[PDB]
Design a protein around this ligand. Structure first.
Ligand SMILES: *[C@@H]1O[C@H](CO)[C@@H](O)[C@H](O)[C@H]1NC(C)=O
Ligand SMILES: *[C@@H]1O[C@H](CO)[C@@H](O)[C@H](O)[C@H]1NC(C)=O
Lengths: 162, 54, 222, 171, 108, 171, 222
């Protein structure tokens, strides 16, 4: 089950970043359950932002996010400015810090920069806070796993008659 | 909590040292009076519960 | 579980009859076939009698055959033994106990079991002689080092000795009795202690003799 | 399976509480019942030895690998669950096999002891009687209560009634 | 370590909740913590971040621990933010760890 | 359990090194001893087949998961210790069960072969002798050393002495 | 473990007597019953004799019954066989060996075992004829490619051939013997080698014939 986070951002943040690597409707798009936060002006610093998600369900939820790593200094300055980037995630049962790193890497799917995905389980009644300065891939909707299922990894075709 | 015996939390002031052949842990075991976490907490908890004195 | 009661002990003169009776609890007595055995003072075990769970057959031992009588009652859970013409060959400790016996001496309920209900409780210590039940005489054996108490000139000998009401049990040695030329026995009991507390502690030895109702207490000093 | 307990003996003797394998006789004196000590004691000793070898176990010491009040890593937790469930299934199968085999062996051992006592009594009654098949012995001349005990005491002499039985069967 | 058996040392890395708290506690300098032994080497840098209040506090402390073998030396080079160990621990003997909720019966 | 080895044969023949199941006879010639080849060879072949099926094992290759000269992570080390101790206990129990069952089966199989040879010799001596019970055969007329070998060679004819035995038992 | 010694081979004329004797070591010989078997040249196996561990019964084979004699001694661990009137039907390889036999031919110590002590060692190759023990004649068969050696006109035929003292064993082919119209046999033995080392290496063939004490060595060249 996908549940919207309700995160809001000021007019200084362009939350509709797209790229040619993720095609959805013939145009450049991104992941459906995530949003790319960059500076609206192509040379300004990303403002220090704080966002809080509060779980209101009776069951545990599963939240995923991403840490961006540009491929050049020019891309970093264009996307998040010349400021020192710092990302901090904090909850009652989880605390971590991530710093974006610029590095030259080979092209995969036509792109050199990378994104490291992280995930955690938020328990009912807990609050999770993201304090970011630029480079955070925010979760537009979080996930909730429901029930038990049998996972099968195979290559044989499906027979719906036996 | 077993971690509070090593770090010296208030709730473990009665159990900072001692000797025993069986250590009993409870569900309400408090390890941090100041909020925080422990790296490789499962291995340390196993080491403490397997020990017989501190 | 293993709790019992025994009666019939004392000082019986030769020629009269002894009557012993033991009653156990903590289990179903009406099924276990019981045995009476005797052990002469010193060593040596000699079986006396066996009885079925219902009292069908006795099968006495040839040493006391036709002279003793074993009986049991399952209502009050009691086992009694009566013997007459008590010669010197009958002064011994008599144990009533449940031993591994033929199956039909037991009941069908405990056949299918590996429990092997074990017993033998305590003793009786029957003695036959010209009674002359005497009272004990206690003397304190006073000076690492040691100190003790010597109890002499009494009869019979179901005597017990303790140190400080039965508290000190380390390094203690209770020696066997010695019979002498006056029909009387003696017994020493000592305890060791390092050589630094001569006039320091309160050392008290207690002696209990049952068939004289005698309780003696003594203290040791340099 | 021998033909004694589940074979030619088509009925058990619930009234025979004296033992597992006993004798029931009907002579001119009347009806009487007794029990054989040897076979019953053999069966009891074998069953008690089985139980004694069964109930003893040192059970090498084990300790806790899973935390009860905290969360374990998911992959190692799944590995531990898989291992412990496999061990549970293995022990369950072995328990089933042991129980079934031991029950079968106990029943067939009781049957074998019954047939062995039967063959002993037959070797005793060699040439003076016949077996009707339903566990009984059609004595062709007679047997006193003392003769019955002699059959129990394994002291019955057949050369004492051999010529009598021969003369009774011929005439 | 001067003992014939191994010892167990724990320490903490502080993480403030605001820039003001960091400047008041350790100043405006660049904080760096380095732990080094013959069998262990690590580096920790305190990080400022806004976090919800737990037990009334927002800043956090990450606890670390290691086993020092007999005859080994362990060095802490810190610039501010280190939670120092006043006393270290030594585990003695074996024990059976039980995690349960049933009460204790001292008669069985 | 059959009544042969632990039953009516109350004594073994330590002096009979010729085989596991042999004959001892006493006739007018004197005392003699021999051994039956068939039952002994059957028992030996069965035991050797047991041993052959026992000693063969491919023992699928395994490798080292625990380091001997370095320290392993505590949790995974505890998991490995738990798993290996559980496997040790399982194999110990299976070894105990296999050993006990195989010993019981070997003893009872020797007993069964003894009783089968006994029944063979009885079918040979059908109507010319009687079995006293203690493993012996009270021959009512006679038996030569050649007759003894014929009993061994399974060639003894009872119709040759049937009328003789009948006349000796009647008169 | 498996180490032996055999004696009695050679060239015996028809009508005389052959005597063979084999002695083994590495085990307890005094318990295993031993067997003598023969195999005619070519193929075909025919059993000769069996003996008990103590020599109680022989039970000879009908083909040589009453004509041969097998015997054994457990002190020196030896097994001998003697046969007379050696016709052409006796020229064969005689193997002394331990085979799976009836149990009483063996001892009670090796009954309870799955070892199945296995043997058959080597051969003897007895031959009977007008002896005429001849010496071999060697000729070098000289030119991928091949080269070899041909040994002809000798008797008997316990011949062996090696290449460079027994070093080169790849691609070698030792062919069976061929008997001809003069009571003499022949045998070729070749070895292959690529066609690039004609005048390059030292190719030497060695031929050993035992019942003439003959050792021949030859070299191959274009
Ligand atoms: C069976 O006998 C045992 C003792 O051997 C006893 O504990 C148990 O209660 C009995 N059960 C029944 C159903 O008779
Ligand atoms: C038993 O026999 C085996 C060979 O079958 C032998 O190796 C072993 O030493 C013997 N042991 C005894 C005690 O006789």
């Amino acid at each position: 089950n996908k549940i919207s986070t309700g995160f809001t951002y000021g007019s200084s943040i362009n939350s509709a970043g797209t790229t040619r690597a993720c095609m959805r409707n013939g145009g450049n798009s991104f992941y459906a359950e995530l949003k790319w936060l960059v500076s609206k002006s192509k040379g300004q610093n990303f403002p220090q932002t704080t966002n809080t998600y509060r779980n209101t369900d009776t069951a545990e939820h599963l939240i995923m996010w991403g840490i961006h790593h540009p491929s050049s200094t020019q891309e970093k300055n264009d996307l998040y400015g010349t400021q020192s980037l710092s990302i901090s995630v904090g909850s009652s049962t989880y605390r971590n810090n991530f710093v974006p790193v610029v590095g030259a890497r080979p092209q995969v799917n036509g792109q050199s920069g990378r994104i490291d995905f992280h995930w955690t389980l938020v328990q009912p009644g807990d609050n999770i806070t993201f304090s970011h300065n630029g480079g955070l891939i925010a979760p537009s909707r979080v996930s909730k796993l429901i029930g038990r299922g049998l996972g099968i990894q195979s290559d044989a075709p499906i027979d719906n008659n036996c | 909590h077993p971690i509070g015996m090593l770090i010296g939390t208030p709730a473990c002031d009665l159990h900072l040292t001692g000797m025993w052949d069986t250590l009993i842990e409870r569900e309400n075991a408090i390890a941090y009076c100041y909020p925080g976490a422990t790296v490789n907490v499962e291995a340390l908890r196993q080491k403490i519960m397997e020990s017989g004195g501190i | 579980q293993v709790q019992l009661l025994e009666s019939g002990g004392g000082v019986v003169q030769p020629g009269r009859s002894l009557r012993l009776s033991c009653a156990a609890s903590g289990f179903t007595f009406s099924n276990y076939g019981m045995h009476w055995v005797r052990q002469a003072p010193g060593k040596g075990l000699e079986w006396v009698a066996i009885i079925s769970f219902d009292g069908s057959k006795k099968y006495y031992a040839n040493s006391v055959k036709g002279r003793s009588t074993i009986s049991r009652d399952n209502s009050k859970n009691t086992l009694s033994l009566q013997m007459e013409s008590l010669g010197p060959e009958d002064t011994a400790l008599y144990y009533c106990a449940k031993l591994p016996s033929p199956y039909y001496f037991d009941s069908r309920f405990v056949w299918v079991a590996a429990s092997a209900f074990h017993f033998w409780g305590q003793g009786i210590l029957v003695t036959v002689s010209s009674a002359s039940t005497k009272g004990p005489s206690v003397f304190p054996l006073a000076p690492t080092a040691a100190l003790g108490c010597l109890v002499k000139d009494y009869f019979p000998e179901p005597v017990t000795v303790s140190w400080n009401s039965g508290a000190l049990t380390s390094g203690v040695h209770t020696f066997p009795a010695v019979l002498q030329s006056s029909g009387l026995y003696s017994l020493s009991s000592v305890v060791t202690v390092p050589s630094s507390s001569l006039g320091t502690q309160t050392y008290i030895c207690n002696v209990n003799h049952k068939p004289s109702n005698t309780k003696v207490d003594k203290r040791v000093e340099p | 399976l021998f033909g004694a307990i589940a074979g030619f003996l088509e009925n058990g003797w619930e009234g025979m509480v004296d033992g597992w394998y006993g004798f029931r006789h009907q002579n001119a004196q009347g009806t009487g019942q007794a029990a054989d000590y040897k076979s019953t004691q053999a069966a009891i000793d074998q069953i008690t030895g089985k139980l004694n070898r069964l109930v003893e176990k040192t059970n090498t010491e084990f300790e806790s690998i899973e935390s009860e009040f905290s969360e374990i890593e998911h992959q190692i937790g799944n590995v531990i669950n898989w291992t412990k469930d496999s061990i549970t299934d293995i022990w369950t199968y072995q328990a089933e096999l042991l129980v079934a085999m031991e029950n079968q062996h106990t029943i067939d051992m009781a049957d074998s002891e019954m047939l062995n006592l039967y063959e002993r009594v037959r070797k005793q009654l060699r040439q003076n009687a016949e077996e009707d098949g339903k566990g009984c012995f059609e004595i062709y001349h007679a047997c006193d209560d003392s003769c019955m005990e002699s059959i129990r005491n394994n002291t019955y002499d057949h050369s004492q009634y051999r010529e009598e039985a021969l003369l009774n069967r011929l005439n």
